[PDB]
Structure formats: structure tokens, C-alpha cells
């Protein structure tokens, strides 16, 4: 126990900081959920498609504040020592945002934009940044969502959306085609493309 | 020592109570399964009133499986027995309409409190996912009536994605069923 | 359909699930003391007495914290959050079960144990010691007494393997009289450990 | 493909640097192996117990050089982005060294010492350091080894070693007892203790 | 007993396993060009001709690199390292199989394909195109022509679903005449895709 | 087209060759298993010479399973057939003694080249782990003879930990067997 006291202290510290970041993370998740259910209402009725966006946005801001918080929770490097939690959640948020901006205008946000919105810095030299993989997976979820959506636009009577969406997803997809394997998500989208093209042909 | 003569007994009591309770859970789960089966018939609408009455007798058998109560220690058997009931019942309601749909497990614990009670918390929010399944069933029965099922499932979903995630297993499969449905209400309108 | 309350229920649960966790942890340390003391006895015999007074000194503390865990439990919610404190409770029951073999030639019982941990017996009395936890806390005792018999032989005592072998003999019998849950495997393991202690007892013929 | 070109380039870069660290890692593994088989000879015959140590040491030095190399391969933080490879290998080396020093004198090396030997810096503020978890697991392997060893000391006739080893492992073990769970290795040693105490009682 | 050579064998293997990997990668890009071109055809028809001249322009390059992969293969070592280039080879065979449907009304064959990729046929000739790889490269073609039939209908062509349906009809038959390995599942999938194209062909009645 | 009339055939040839080869692999694997079984008898030492001869006939059946050779495409059947052989053979040697032990797969490919050959690379270094198993068998047969098995297994191990790691599955279990052995040679010397 001569030196093991120091190590018990150190590790109790690290696990502490972990189950202390977990707090902030849950706190983000909840907001995310709020927005998420709202976009479910864009799935139910097209009128709310706008007010809903507004709402989701005012959730995104708060999330940004609490990301300032987590950014404060990560020491020196270590960013990847505590990576995971906020990877799944920020995949959620990158999604939310990309979806929202597509609902607004006919394109997908950039890494940069999503970053500025979440009060996050872009490059890894800034301590707490918005990693790329995260971004990509987020927009992949975007692609998955727009399918169910177009389907539900013809559902409630809209022979217009599915085309824009089919282009968007078309060239986005080809966008992933030039990416490499090291990865099942890229294939999944490879399929949602098929679903939308199908709903378009139905016109 | 001669201590264990009281231990083995002391817990054997539990073995027994658990077994008999599992009996009542089998009887309730199947006895209810038959009720939703009845609600699968679509004809006329006698099945609705006869079914609601039958459920009201299952409040008597539930009255039985709570009779011997004086905690979660035994809630293990609360399986299908308590779950199936919530499904069939809530189905009675969310096809009874034609939007809460409708019960609310507190009102249920209120009709169970008349048993003088069987606690009814998260088992409820589960039984109601099972009820999503059920709605899917009412719809698949069709083929102008699937649409109701679609709206219903979109609301349910929005209300099941709306919480904290266990249940991920239920909510995922529920999303899949809502995709089934949405795809049908979509294919209708050619 | 307004899941605000629907989720808020479990949202009130979680907080509790934490307020008990802190307790589980501080207790974890409390017993960690004792455990170290008892790991001391495989190295030097002339510590026994001390390690008792100390371990018990620790336990009269554990109970005090356990009562804090008591009022946190509303009526019949013992078996709703129990899973947090059982694995620890067993380590205490085990601590005890060891100390009272190192002081006397037998083991304690549900009652004797609960009275020390400031707990009750029947669920009706309130916060209690589930018999299962008791039993499981008891078994480990054996797998311990195996190593302790080996060591205590490394140190000149010819009586330790005997006494211990009697102790475990009767324990085994008592766990055989029980129903023929998931503790069965542990009973088999006990059988193994009995075999070992018997081997040792034989070997004390030279 | 507008922006996806940049991301394809970036990720091809990252995977490159990865399968470029892998080289250096294999290169370390081999040396490790050499030393490892030598200590196998301490298992066969007690005369070589010394020359063998010497050998293992001259392997450890080289490994240190190539760790200077890998330390050069890790940019900014990122240390934990490319953590794993050298964690398994350096677990191997921490082991090797701790074992060697026990063979030399009757104690276990420190984090620090193992560090200096591998030309590694100690704290994480130094970019490439020797993480603690790694250290711990390494010495756990040490404990696992000394059992087979004592057994094989009485095997070839030595009613002395198993006692020193039983003390060493005794208080080391109690050393891990004051550590926390967040972990099957600690229990495994909890058992090797039993094996050695057994071989001691046999005296 | 001196495993210096014992391991040094595989140690000489690995290097090779790499020198072929670089090739596999550059080829991967080479075909990535073509693949992009063909993903272009689900968006605009008036590109067809071009996408051919380009894709083929790419292929006359692939073969040149494939020959580099050839001399790296000592005698009968094709099936010792093949696993690296098969999954790619199939993507090429597929590229081809597509281009020659976009230019003509049929598919290419083992010979026709190998002559283009600067490869041989029988293992005895040297570096060859394993028939399996050929077949697998062929199947994907279908799952493609399904989406391409859907889109090509989104763009006014009533003949595409027909032609395609004939093509896939005969392909299917040909894969049914084969033994009743692990390609069977892929054949089932083919069955599915045939069903789909038939649906589409019917639907062209309005 | 009428193309596939040549494809289906062209590969069916492979189906057949593979099947017959698997036949010869069954015959060799079992025909060898019996030989090591014979080497399990410990008595006298006729089993050694009779066994070596029998193995020399299995060089004739191996002569058969290479007969139809003109690559790895078929090496799949090289299972137990080629592995079992290396085991039994190497066993003949590492109990033939009383330290290479002894063969070396190159010498083997040299006695197989007389077949005029079946390549013999990593399948060798595997068959020799199987031979570690075998030594364990010779030892377990005992009960002054286990010690040889212990030294043998410590050398083997040092020579199997000595390489690059597939085989981890073999080498781990081999370590376990070396622990068995070391524990026995240890328990002997009370």
C-alpha cells in the first residue's frame, strides 16, 4: 500500500470526473429529446414545420451553453479519454441541426456552422471541438430521416418535397461514395437513396 | 445448526407464493390474450361490450392475484400477466374511439384500488407499447381505417421517443412498426 | 398525451437511485477497512484480537450509516432499490461471520447480525436484512477459511484445519438441508472448498 | 462532393497515420518477444536467471528508442485517439521490466523507473507518457508470472523462492485490495495469491 | 529449436501481403472513378456515352496496374493471397458488366472480361480471373439495374424496364442452371430483384 | 446465355475434386488417429517400429491425396488430414527419443517430394502444437517419465511464444497444458 494510496486517490479522481461529465451529458440529452419530438410533429403536420424549427433552435442554443460547460470539464488533451458520451449525443445534435437547416433551406449545414451554433470550436487545437466523424454520422441520420419524411409528404399530400429530397440525398450519397472504409452507415444511406428514388418514380 | 430449519422454511414460503402467483399470471395473461383475440374480429360491435365486461371480470382475477399481498420481491411474475392486460385493455380503448386513448395507469390503479390494489408504474408505459403493437394489429386487419392507426402510432411514438433511454428494445421495434404504418397510409394514396 | 408526469416519475426515481449510491460508496469504504484488517490475518496471528476490536469498531459505524439508508426507503420500496446495497450488505454479513469465528467457535445468525447492523428481520418491521443476503454473505466465509486454514498451517497451528473443518462441515450440512434460486452454484463451490479443507486436515499427519 | 473532397483527404490522412503507427508498434512487439522467451529460460534453468535479465534489459533499451519514435508519431493531444496499440504492448513491457527487477532485487519497479527506462515521460502533460492503467496491468502480469515461477522453483529444487514471492505477492495483492472497480484482473491475482500461499504451505 | 526461419517464412510473407495491398488500394481508386461515373447515370441520361468512354478509359489503366499485381504472384500463389484483390476484382467485373449493357444489349463473359483486364483464364496460363469473382461481379449488376430501371422510368423511358427485365430474366435462368458455395444467398437476392423489376414492368401500363 | 453450360461444369469439376480430396483427408486423419492411439499404449517397444512403418504407408495414402495435384484452392481439406499426420508423426519422434524432436516440416516435404509432393508450411507449425497436446498425452499416461514431457513442453512453449500473433487460440491452450505439466513435475517432488 506504500504507493498504492496515491493511485487509489488518482483513479477515484478520474472516475469522479467521469461520472461528473455524465451529469452534463444527460442534461444535454434531455434538451435534444425535446427538439426531437418537435420534429416528430413536422412528421404529423406541415403547418408546424416552421414553428417547430424555431423551437428546436431555441433548444440548440441552450445545448450550446452546456457545451461551454463540458468544454470546461475536459482537461488538457484527455478529450479522447472522455470522448464517447458527447459523441453519441452530439451525433444527435448535429443531426437535429442539419435536419432543421434542411427544413429551412434546401441544403445541409457545414461542420463550421454546426460548431458555431453549439458554441464549439472547430479544430482539435482548441481543446474541445466538434470532431468530424461525429459530424458525418449526424448528417447520416439526417439522410435516414428525410426518407420517412418524403414518404410522409406524399402521405399527407405533397408531390413536391420527395423530389427536392431525392436530389439532396442523391448528391449527398454520391458525396459519401468518395469516402473510405475503416462504416455500415454509408451503406444504410446507400439504401435510403433507393427508398426515396422509389417514392419519386411513383410520381 | 438447527437454525436453518427456520431459514429453509422462511424462504420456502416465498417459493410457494411466487409459484401460485405465477399461476394467476398465466391465467391472466392467456385469459387476456383471448380478449385481444376477440378484438381482432375486424362485422358488428358486440365484441366491444362483451369484451369490456370480460375485462371487468379480469379485474376480479387481478383482484385474486393481489389478494395475497402484504413489494417488487414478487413483481417478477408481473410479466405478460400484468403487461398483456394493459395491452388488451388499452386496445379496447384505442379502437373504442373509432387523443389520449385513453386510460392512464393511474386511473387503472384507481379501478384496481377498488380491490378491497396492484401497483402500476412502468409496467404501464410498457403495456402501452404493447398496445402500439395492438393498433398495428387492428390496422393490418384492414384490407380508410389505417389512417387512424397511423396518427395514433405517430402520437404514441412522439410520446415514447419523448423520454429517457431497457425500453430501447421496445421503442426501436415501435419505430419500425410506425414505419410500416406510415408506409401503408402512404401507399393507400397512390 | 402529456408524458411530463409519465417520465417525471422515473425522473424522481433516479435522484433517489443516487442518494442511495453515495451511501453504498461510503459504506464500501467503511467495510474496506475491515477487509484490509482481515487480509492482515493471513500474515500474522498475534493480530487477531486487535483486528476484531477494530473491525467491530468499524461496524458500529456501518450501522449508523445504514440507518441513513433506512429513512431513504419509503415504506415498501426495499425490493425496488435493494440491488444497490445487497452486494455490499453481503460483504458486511461476511465480515461479521468471520470476526465471530475468530472470537468464538461458531457463526452468527440473521438476528444476531441484524441487531449489530441496526437492521430488522421481517419485512413488516421495516428496513430489514433479506435472508438471501445473509446466506450469501455466509458462503464467502468458506472460500476464505480455506486460504486461512492453509496459511494458519504455514504458521504452526495444527488445530486450525480441524476447527475450520468442523465449522465448514456443519455449514455445508445446513446448506444441504435448504431447498434442493441462483445460490445453488455457490453451494457446489462450497462442496469443493470442503473437499480442500478435508485434504488439508488429512495432511496434518506428519 | 463539394466539401467531401476535403474530408476524404483528411480521413485518408488519419487512417494513414494509424497504419503508420502500427509499423512502429509491431517493431516494438518483436523485441518484447525476444526478451519474453528469455524469461522463459529463467523458467527452464536458474543459472541463466541473470544473463537472461541482462539480455531482456538490452532489449528494453531499444524498445525505449523506438518509443521516442512513437512519441514523435503522436500529434498534440490525440494521444488517446491512438491509445490502444501501445497499451497492449507497453503492458507487455511494463511486465517484462517489473519481472526483471524482481529477479534482480526483491521489489517491483515504480511507474517512474519503468518510464525512464522506456525513454518515456511520466505525466500526460508531456504528450506521450506512460499511463497508469497500463502500469497496473503490467505488474498484474508480473504477479501472474511469479506463480508459475515459484512452482517451478520447487520443481527444480528451491524451497526458498516461493516464500519471498509469497510475501511480495501477499502485500502487492493487499495493495490492489485498496483499489476500486470500474477489473477482473484484480480478482485473478486474488487467486494467484492462493496458488503461491499453497506452494508455501507445502514447505 | 531455432524458430528463426520458422517465423521468418511468414515474416517474408507479410511484406508481400503489403506490396499487394498498395496495389489493391490504387486500383480501388481507379475503379472509384468509374463508380462515380455510373452513379451519375441515375441523374442524367445524356451522359451515357461519355461515362462509357471515361470508364473504359479508366479500365485500360486498371489492367496496367493489374499486371503489376501479376509478377508479384510467384507461380501457384494466386489462391494464397487472392483474398486481397477479389472484392475489388468483382467491382471491376461489375463495372464492365454494366458498361457493356449500357453500350450493347447483353453482358460480357469470362474471356471478354479477362482480355480487357489483361488477365488470363485457366490457372495454368498464369494469373487468371477466378470464375467465382466473375459471377459475383455479375450479380451486383442486377441490384444496380433495379434502381437504374426505377430512375430511368422517372425520366420518360418506357423501354428500359423491358430491356432490363429481359436481361435479368436470362441472367436469373443462367444462375439457376448452376449447381443447386456461399453465392447461393446472392442468387436468392437476385430472385427478389427480378420480382421488383417485373413489378415495375407491369406498372408501365399507364 | 448458353455460356453457363461451361461455367457450371467448369466449377463442378472443383466440387468433385474437393469432395474426393475430403475423402482422402478423412481416411488420412482417422488412419493416423489410430497410430497415435497405438502410441498411447504406454510394455514393450514393437509399437514404435510397427507404427513408423504404418506412417510410411500413410506416406503412400498422402501420395494418393497429392496424386491429383496440378495451390491453396483445395488446401481447405488439409484439415486434420494433414494436421493429424504431423501430430502422430512428430509424436513418434518426441517419444522416440526416450532436443529438436525432431522432424522439421522441410524434411517432411523432403520425404513427401519422394511422391513422384504436398506443400508443408504453417500447417506444420500447427501440427506441432497438436504434438504438444500429444506429449501431454504420453505424460498423462504415466502414473520419472513426466519430467521429459515437462522439459519438452517448456522448450516447445518458448518456441511458440517466440513468434508473431489465428494461433493465439493454440498457444493459449498450450500454455495451459504447460502449466498442467509443470504443476505435475512439481507435485512429484513432494
> Do residue F117 and residue F135 come from a single domain?
no
> Do residue D49 and residue D88 come from a single domain?
yes
Q: What's the rounded Cα separation, in Å, for the pair E85 and E83?
A: 6
Determine whether the interchain pair B154/A154 forms a contact, defined as Cβ–Cβ distance below 8 Å: no
Q: What's the rounded Cα separation, in Å, for the pair C98 and C138?
A: 9
Closest residue on chain A to B176 (Cα): A148
Choosing from B123, B139, B160, the residue where a domain stops is B123
Distance (Å) of CA B129 to CA B88, B104, B111, B134, F61? 11, 13, 21, 9, 65
Q: What's the rounded Cα separation, in Å, for the pair B72 and B69?
A: 11
**C neighbour chains, 3+ CB pairs within 8 Å:** B, D
Contact of A135 with A120, CB cutoff 8 Å = no
Q: Name the domain count of chain C.
A: 2
Using CB atoms, pick whichever of E79, E175, E177 lies closest to residue F71. E79
Q: What's the rounded Cα separation, in Å, for the pair A97 and A90?
A: 10
Experimental approach: X-ray
Choosing from E83, E110, E126, the residue where a domain stops is E126
Contact of D157 with D164, CB cutoff 8 Å = no
Cβ-based neighbours of E92, under 8 Å, separated by 6 or more:
E27, E31, E59, E62, E117, E137
Q: Does A167 touch chain B (CB under 8 A)?
A: no
Using CB atoms, pick whichever of F155, F161, F186 lies closest to residue D155. F186
C15 annotated as a binding-site residue:
no
Task: Work out the minimum CA distance from D198 to partner chain C, whole angstroms.
Answer: 7
Phi-psi region of A76 (alpha: psi -120 to 50; beta: other; left: phi over 0): left
Distance (Å) of CA E61 to CA E34, E56, E118, F144? 11, 9, 10, 70
Task: Work out the minimum CA distance from A111 to partner chain E, whole angstroms.
Answer: 24
Contact of D16 with D73, CB cutoff 8 Å = no
> Do residue F90 and residue F155 come from a single domain?
no
Alpha-carbon dihedral sign for residues A168, A170, A174, A177: positive
Q: Does A33 touch chain B (CB under 8 A)?
A: yes
Task: Work out the minimum CA distance from E42 to partner chain A, whole angstroms.
Answer: 9
Q: At what angle do helices E4-39 and F122-141 cross, to 10 degrees?
A: 130
Q: Does A41 touch chain B (CB under 8 A)?
A: yes
Closest residue on chain C to D193 (Cα): C147
Q: What is the Rg, in whole angstroms, of the alpha carbon atoms belonging to chain B?
A: 19
> Do residue E156 and residue E178 come from a single domain?
yes
Q: What's the rounded Cα separation, in Å, for the pair E186 and E100?
A: 22
Closest residue on chain F to D157 (Cα): F189
Is E33 exposed, middle or buried (CB count within 10 Å of its CB: 0-12, 13-18, 19+)?
Answer: middle
Residue A10: which domain range?
1-127
DSSP secondary structure string, F10-47?
Answer: HHHHHHHHHHHHHHHHHHHHHHHHHHHHHTT----SHH
Residue with grid cell 466523424, as numbered in its chain: A133
Backbone angles phi, psi at E19, to 5 degrees: -55, -25
Q: What's the rounded Cα separation, in Å, for the pair E36 and F81?
A: 48
Q: Partners of C120 in the beta sheet?
A: C128
Determine whether the interchain pair B71/C80 forms a contact, defined as Cβ–Cβ distance below 8 Å: yes
Determine whether the interchain pair B158/A40 forms a contact, defined as Cβ–Cβ distance below 8 Å: yes
Decide: helix, strand or coil at residue E79. helix
Q: What's the rounded Cα separation, in Å, for the pair C94 and C73?
A: 24
Instruction: Please report the number of interchain residue pairs, chain A to chain E, with beta-carbon separation below 8 angstroms.
Output: 27
Q: Does E131 touch chain F (CB under 8 A)?
A: yes
Q: What's the rounded Cα separation, in Å, for the pair A174 and A193?
A: 10
CB atoms within 10 A of CB E3: 16
Determine whether the interchain pair D152/F164 forms a contact, defined as Cβ–Cβ distance below 8 Å: no
User: Rounded to 5 degrees, what angle do the CA atoms A153, A159, A162 make?
Assistant: 60
CB atoms within 10 A of CB E96: 25
> How would you label E63-83 residue by residue, b for 16+ Cβ within 10 Å and e otherwise?
bebbeebbeebeebebebbbe
Q: What is the 3-state secondary structure (H, E, C) of C18-68?
A: HHHHHHHHHHHHHHHHHHHHHHHHHCCHHHHHHHHHHHHHHHHHHHHHHHH
Decide: helix, strand or coil at residue A105. coil
Q: What's the rounded Cα separation, in Å, for the pair B122 and B120?
A: 7
CB atoms within 10 A of CB C176: 12
What CATH number did the domain enclosing E68 receive? 1.20.58.190
Decide: helix, strand or coil at residue B114. coil
Q: What's the rounded Cα separation, in Å, for the pair F2 and F4?
A: 6
Choosing from E99, E126, E153, the residue where a domain stops is E126
> Do residue F48 and residue F87 come from a single domain?
yes
Instruction: Please report the number of interchain residue pairs, chain D to chain F, with beta-carbon separation below 8 angstroms.
Output: 39
Q: What's the rounded Cα separation, in Å, for the pair C156 and C33?
A: 27
Query: Which CB contacts under 8 angstroms, 24+ apart, belong to E1-4?
Result: E1/F99, E1/F100, E1/F101, E1/F155, E1/F159, E3/F159, E3/F162, E3/F163
Q: Does E112 touch chain F (CB under 8 A)?
A: no
DSSP secondary structure string, A137-185?
Answer: HHHHHHHHHHHHHHHHHHHTS-SSHHHHHHHHHHHHHHHHHTS----HH
Task: Please report which residue ranges of chain E form alpha helices under DSSP H.
Answer: 4-39, 48-71, 78-81, 86-103, 110-116, 131-154, 160-176, 184-203
CB atoms within 10 A of CB F136: 21
CA atoms within 13 A of residue A189's CA, in its CB half-sphere: 25
The gap between the terminal CA atoms of chain C, to the nearest Å, is: 80
**Which residues in F lie closer than 8 A to residue D45 (C-beta atoms)?**
none
What CATH number did the domain enclosing E187 receive? 1.20.58.200
Alpha-carbon dihedral sign for residues E90, E92, E93, E99: positive
Choosing from F123, F138, F161, the residue where a domain stops is F123
Contact of D49 with D149, CB cutoff 8 Å = no
Residue of A39, A44, A48, A149 best to disrupt the B interface, most CBs of B under 10 A: A44
Q: Does A4 touch chain D (CB under 8 A)?
A: yes
Q: What is the Rg, in whole angstroms, of the alpha carbon atoms belonging to chain C?
A: 20
Q: Does E39 touch chain A (CB under 8 A)?
A: yes
> Do residue A164 and residue A107 come from a single domain?
no
Task: Work out the minimum CA distance from D95 to partner chain C, whole angstroms.
Answer: 25
Contact of A114 with A94, CB cutoff 8 Å = yes
**Which residues in D lie closer than 8 A to residue F158 (C-beta atoms)?**
37, 40-41, 43-44
Nearest C-alpha neighbor of F140 from the set F189, F80, F183, F78? F183
Q: Partners of A121 in the beta sheet?
A: A129
Contact of B139 with B145, CB cutoff 8 Å = yes
The gap between the terminal CA atoms of chain E, to the nearest Å, is: 80
**Which residues in B lie closer than 8 A to residue A29 (C-beta atoms)?**
164
CB atoms within 10 A of CB F40: 14
**Grid coordinates in use for C117?**
447492523
CB atoms within 10 A of CB A4: 17
Q: What's the rounded Cα separation, in Å, for the pair A106 and E159?
A: 33
> Do residue B128 and residue B106 come from a single domain?
no
> Do residue D5 and residue D47 come from a single domain?
yes
The gap between the terminal CA atoms of chain F, to the nearest Å, is: 79
Nearest C-alpha neighbor of C193 from the set C155, C156, C138? C138
> Do residue D123 and residue D180 come from a single domain?
no
Distance (Å) of CA B178 to CA A44, B158, C158? 12, 11, 73
Q: What is the 3-state secondary structure (H, E, C) of A172-200?
A: HHHHHHCCCCCCHHHHHHHHHHHHHHHHH
Q: What is the 3-state secondary structure (H, E, C) of chain B?
A: CCCHHHHHHHHHHHHHHHHHHHHHHHHHHHHHHHHHHHCCCCCCCHHHHHHHHHHHHHHHHHHHHHHCCCCHHHHHHHHHHHHHHHHHHHHHHHCCCCCCCCCCHHHHHHHHCCCCCCCCCHHHHHHHHHHHHHHHHHHHHCCCCHHHHHHHHHHHHHCCCCCCCCCHHHHHHHHHHHHHHHHHHHHHCC
Nearest C-alpha neighbor of E74 from the set F18, F119, F105, F165? F119
Q: What's the rounded Cα separation, in Å, for the pair A30 and A36?
A: 10
CB atoms within 10 A of CB D47: 10
Instruction: Compute, in degrees rounded to 10, the torsion defined by CA atoms E125, E127, E132, E133.
Output: -150
What CATH number did the domain enclosing F154 receive? 1.20.58.200
Task: Work out the minimum CA distance from D144 to partner chain C, whole angstroms.
Answer: 18
> Do residue D173 and residue D94 come from a single domain?
no
Instruction: Compute, in degrees rounded to 10, the torsion defined by CA atoms D177, D182, D184, D189.
Output: -20
Distance (Å) of CA B106 to CA B9, B101, B120, B162, E121? 37, 14, 7, 20, 75
> Do residue D16 and residue D104 come from a single domain?
yes
Distance (Å) of CA C48 to CA C38, C42, C98, C104? 8, 10, 11, 12
Contact of E148 with E42, CB cutoff 8 Å = yes
Distance (Å) of CA B55 to CA B29, B33, B78, B103, D46? 12, 11, 17, 14, 82
Determine whether the interchain pair F8/E79 forms a contact, defined as Cβ–Cβ distance below 8 Å: no
Q: Does A201 touch chain B (CB under 8 A)?
A: no
> Do residue D103 and residue D118 come from a single domain?
yes
**Grid coordinates in use for B12?**
420456502
> Do residue C133 and residue C122 come from a single domain?
no
Residue with grid cell 451522359, as numbered in its chain: E47
User: Rounded to 5 degrees, what angle do the CA atoms E74, E75, E81 make?
Assistant: 60
Choosing from E73, E102, E126, the residue where a domain stops is E126
**A neighbour chains, 3+ CB pairs within 8 Å:** B, D, E
Q: Partners of D129 in the beta sheet?
A: D121
Using CB atoms, pick whichever of D40, D44, D155 lies closest to residue F189. D155
Q: Partners of C128 in the beta sheet?
A: C120
DSSP secondary structure string, D2-36?
Answer: TTHHHHHHHHHHHHHHHHHHHHHHHHHHHHHHHHH
**D neighbour chains, 3+ CB pairs within 8 Å:** A, C, F
Q: What's the rounded Cα separation, in Å, for the pair C201 and C162?
A: 6
Nearest C-alpha neighbor of A37 from the set B158, E19, F123? B158
Alpha-carbon dihedral sign for residues B49, B54, B58, B61: positive
Residue B10: which domain range?
1-123
Contact of F87 with F32, CB cutoff 8 Å = yes
**B neighbour chains, 3+ CB pairs within 8 Å:** A, C
Instruction: Please report the number of interchain residue pairs, chain B to chain C, with beta-carbon separation below 8 angstroms.
Output: 55
Task: Work out the minimum CA distance from E79 to partner chain F, whole angstroms.
Answer: 5
Decide: helix, strand or coil at residue A106. coil
DSSP 8-class letter at C155: T
> How would you label E98-124 residue by residue, b for 16+ Cβ within 10 Å and e otherwise?
bbbbeeeeebbbbeebbebbbbbbeee
Q: Partners of D121 in the beta sheet?
A: D129
Distance (Å) of CA E128 to CA B9, B34, E59, E82? 77, 65, 17, 11
* A touches F, CB cut-off 8 Å, minimum 3 pairs: no
Q: What's the rounded Cα separation, in Å, for the pair B136 and D75?
A: 54
Instruction: Compute, in degrees rounded to 10, the torsion defined by CA atoms C41, C43, C47, C49.
Output: 30
Choosing from F100, F123, F146, the residue where a domain stops is F123
CB atoms within 10 A of CB A50: 12
Task: Please report which residue ranges of chain D form alpha helices under DSSP H.
Answer: 4-44, 49-73, 84-104, 111-117, 132-155, 161-177, 184-201
Q: What's the rounded Cα separation, in Å, for the pair A23 and B20?
A: 43
Contact of A139 with A107, CB cutoff 8 Å = no
Contact of A196 with A166, CB cutoff 8 Å = yes
Contact of B138 with B95, CB cutoff 8 Å = yes
Decide: helix, strand or coil at residue D95. helix
**Which residues in D lie closer than 8 A to residue C42 (C-beta atoms)?**
170, 197
Q: Does C158 touch chain B (CB under 8 A)?
A: no
Q: What's the rounded Cα separation, in Å, for the pair B76 and B18?
A: 9
Distance between alpha carbon E146 and the CA centroid of its chain, in Å?
Answer: 16
Contact of A142 with A92, CB cutoff 8 Å = no
> Do residue D95 and residue D148 come from a single domain?
no
Determine whether the interchain pair E42/A177 forms a contact, defined as Cβ–Cβ distance below 8 Å: no
> Do residue C111 and residue C13 come from a single domain?
yes
Q: What's the rounded Cα separation, in Å, for the pair D34 and D49?
A: 15
Greatest extent of chain F over all pairs of C-alpha atoms, in Å: 79
DSSP secondary structure string, C62-128?
Answer: HHHHHHHHHHTS-SS-HHHHGGGTHHHHHHHHHHHHHHHHHHSSS---HHHHHHHTT-BSSTTTSSB
Is A94 exposed, middle or buried (CB count within 10 Å of its CB: 0-12, 13-18, 19+)?
Answer: buried
Q: What's the rounded Cα separation, in Å, for the pair B57 and B66?
A: 14
CA atoms within 13 A of residue E120's CA, in its CB half-sphere: 10
**Grid coordinates in use for A24?**
452534463
Q: Does C11 touch chain B (CB under 8 A)?
A: yes
CA atoms within 13 A of residue A51's CA, in its CB half-sphere: 5
Q: Name the domain count of chain F.
A: 2
What CATH number did the domain enclosing B84 receive? 1.20.58.190
> Do residue A57 and residue A120 come from a single domain?
yes
Alpha-carbon dihedral sign for residues F145, F148, F150, F152: negative
Nearest C-alpha neighbor of F39 from the set F24, F54, F23? F54
Determine whether the interchain pair B186/A151 forms a contact, defined as Cβ–Cβ distance below 8 Å: yes
Q: Does A6 touch chain D (CB under 8 A)?
A: no
Cβ-based neighbours of A63, under 8 Å, separated by 6 or more:
A28, A31, A32, A93, A118
Distance between alpha carbon F34 and the CA centroid of its chain, in Å?
Answer: 13
Alpha-carbon dihedral sign for residues D185, D189, D192, D198: negative
Q: What's the rounded Cα separation, in Å, for the pair E115 and E136?
A: 18
Q: What's the rounded Cα separation, in Å, for the pair F180 and B174?
A: 53
**Grid coordinates in use for A110?**
457545414
Amino acid at each position: 500500500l506504500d504507493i498504492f494510496s496515491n493511485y487509489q486517490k488518482y483513479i477515484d479522481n478520474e472516475q469522479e470526473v467521469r461520472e461528473n461529465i455524465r451529469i452534463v451529458v444527460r442534461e444535454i440529452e434531455h434538451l435534444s429529446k425535446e427538439a426531437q419530438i418537435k420534429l416528430q410533429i413536422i412528421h404529423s403536420d406541415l403547418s408546424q414545420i416552421s414553428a417547430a424549427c424555431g423551437l428546436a433552435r431555441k433548444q440548440v442554443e441552450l445545448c450550446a451553453q452546456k457545451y461551454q460547460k463540458l468544454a470546461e470539464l475536459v482537461p488538457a488533451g484527455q478529450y479522447y479519454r472522455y470522448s464517447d458520451h458527447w459523441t453519441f449525443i452530439t451525433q444527435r445534435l448535429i443531426f437535429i441541426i442539419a435536419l432543421v437547416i434542411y427544413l429551412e433551406a434546401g441544403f445541409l449545414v457545414t461542420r463550421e456552422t454546426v460548431a458555431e451554433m453549439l458554441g464549439l470550436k472547430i479544430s482539435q487545437s482548441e481543446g474541445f471541438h466538434l470532431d468530424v466523424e461525429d459530424y458525418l454520422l449526424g448528417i447520416l441520420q439526417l439522410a435516414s430521416e428525410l426518407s420517412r419524411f418524403a414518404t410522409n409528404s406524399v402521405t399527407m399530400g405533397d408531390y413536391e418535397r420527395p423530389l427536392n429530397i431525392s436530389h439532396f440525398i442523391g448528391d449527398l450519397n454520391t458525396g459519401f461514395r468518395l469516402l473510405n472504409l475503416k462504416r455500415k452507415r454509408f451503406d444504410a444511406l446507400k439504401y435510403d437513396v433507393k427508398k426515396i428514388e422509389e417514392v419519386v418514380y411513383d410520381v | 445448526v438447527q437454525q436453518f430449519r427456520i431459514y429453509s422454511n422462511e424462504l420456502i414460503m416465498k417459493h410457494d407464493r411466487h409459484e401460485r402467483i405465477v399461476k394467476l399470471s398465466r391465467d391472466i395473461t392467456i385469459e387476456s390474450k383471448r380478449i385481444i383475440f376477440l378484438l381482432h374480429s375486424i362485422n358488428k360491435e358486440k365484441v366491444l361490450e362483451e369484451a369490456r365486461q370480460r375485462l371487468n371480470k379480469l379485474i376480479a382475477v387481478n383482484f385474486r392475484a393481489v389478494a395475497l399481498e402484504l413489494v417488487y420481491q414478487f413483481r417478477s411474475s408481473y410479466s405478460p400477466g400484468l403487461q398483456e392486460f394493459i395491452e388488451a385493455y388499452t386496445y379496447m380503448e384505442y379502437l373504442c374511439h373509432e387523443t389520449k386513448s385513453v386510460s392512464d395507469w393511474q386511473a387503472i390503479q384507481a379501478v384496481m384500488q377498488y380491490v378491497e390494489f396492484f401497483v402500476d408504474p412502468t409496467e404501464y408505459i410498457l403495456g402501452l407499447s404493447d398496445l402500439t403493437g395492438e393498433l398495428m394489429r387492428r390496422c393490418i386487419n384492414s384490407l380508410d381505417t389505417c389512417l387512424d392507426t397511423c396518427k395514433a402510432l405517430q402520437h404514441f411514438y412522439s410520446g415514447y421517443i419523448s423520454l429517457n433511454c431497457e425500453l430501447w428494445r421496445k421503442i426501436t421495434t415501435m419505430k419500425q412498426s410506425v414505419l410500416k404504418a406510415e408506409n401503408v397510409c402512404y401507399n393507400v394514396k397512390v
